[PDB]
């Protein structure tokens, strides 16, 4: 009958629940990039850990190994398209140099306020929540949505949102009536 459904975890808990250094460093990451909870930062840590581990495992191999070649260019390609790796810095010895801040910057929430669409990062988030941003003619409502390089310059207000042309919001309509 029905088969097993595939599920995966995207977060790994820290080995030490209480260390002041880690707690401060993670709270600062929540601060700069407006996040919701520690799971939000552990998710990025986990993705970065996967990337770094894959790079290390490939680098254990010599330069012209078939697997090394294929997987290395694939990984570098994905990172470039996300905008996390430097398009001149095409190597795994250099992909083993990234930080959680690189990934956290490419989030839609950060770009919304970085490009001026919103004042504060919290403003960016509540706009993305209330469906006032669109990407390449698509209303994205996920503050964690990553912005590819191509999508970087094609993000503006929704064509419907009252701040992008549309029926006035509830407050305005109440006042008008």
């Amino acid at each position: 009958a029905r088969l097993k459904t595939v599920q995966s975890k995207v977060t790994k808990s820290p080995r030490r629940p209480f260390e002041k250094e880690r707690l401060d460093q993670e709270l600062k990451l929540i601060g700069t990039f407006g996040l919701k909870n520690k799971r939000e930062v552990w998710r990025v840590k986990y993705t970065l850990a996967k990337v770094r581990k894959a790079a290390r495992e490939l680098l254990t191999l010599e330069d012209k190994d078939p697997k090394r070649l294929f997987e290395g260019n694939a990984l570098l390609r994905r990172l470039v398209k996300i905008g996390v790796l430097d398009e001149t810095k095409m190597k795994l010895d250099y992909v083993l140099g990234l930080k959680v801040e690189d990934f956290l910057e490419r989030r839609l929430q950060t770009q919304v306020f970085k490009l001026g669409l919103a004042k504060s990062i919290h403003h960016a988030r509540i706009l993305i929540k209330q469906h006032h941003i669109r990407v390449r003619r698509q209303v994205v409502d996920v503050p964690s949505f990553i912005v590819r390089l191509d999508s970087q310059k094609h993000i503006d207000f929704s064509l419907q949102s009252p701040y992008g042309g549309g029926r006035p919001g509830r407050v305005k309509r109440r006042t008008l009536r």
Binding site: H131, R134, R137, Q138, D141, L159, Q160
Partner: protein
């Protein structure tokens, strides 16, 4: 309301044409199937009852929306190679009232207990 048809294929061994239909209705609600049907019929210079749109799902935030359409050569081929429910949906056919599965099953089981022509009577 821009209706666009892609991946058009001609199925002579089923006397029709299969196409993917996409509608653009920014601000407007989902396009009613009758409205889509008229536009496709005009597009293919064909009767507005020899075209079968179905499977129309609407993308978020309005705008885009996709579905499938079947262009049929004529109404006989239509109501020969077609499930009954599609025809009932589009008015080409009429639904036949039927008792529920539970009651049909119980009647069959009761009839199994009767032999001869009294089976038709028992109910």
């Amino acid at each position: 309301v821009t209706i666009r048809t892609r991946k058009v294929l001609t199925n002579k061994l089923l006397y029709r044409k299969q196409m993917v239909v996409e509608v653009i209705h920014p601000g407007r609600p989902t396009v009613p199937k009758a409205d889509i049907r008229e536009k496709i019929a005009k597009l293919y210079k064909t009767t507005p009852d020899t075209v079968i749109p179905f499977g129309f799902e609407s993308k978020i935030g309005g705008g885009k929306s996709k579905g499938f359409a079947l262009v049929y050569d004529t109404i006989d081929f239509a109501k020969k190679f077609e499930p009954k429910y599609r025809l009932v949906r589009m008015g080409l056919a009429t639904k036949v009232e039927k008792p529920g599965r539970k009651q049909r099953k119980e009647r069959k089981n009761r009839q199994k207990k009767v032999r001869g022509t009294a089976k038709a009577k028992v109910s």
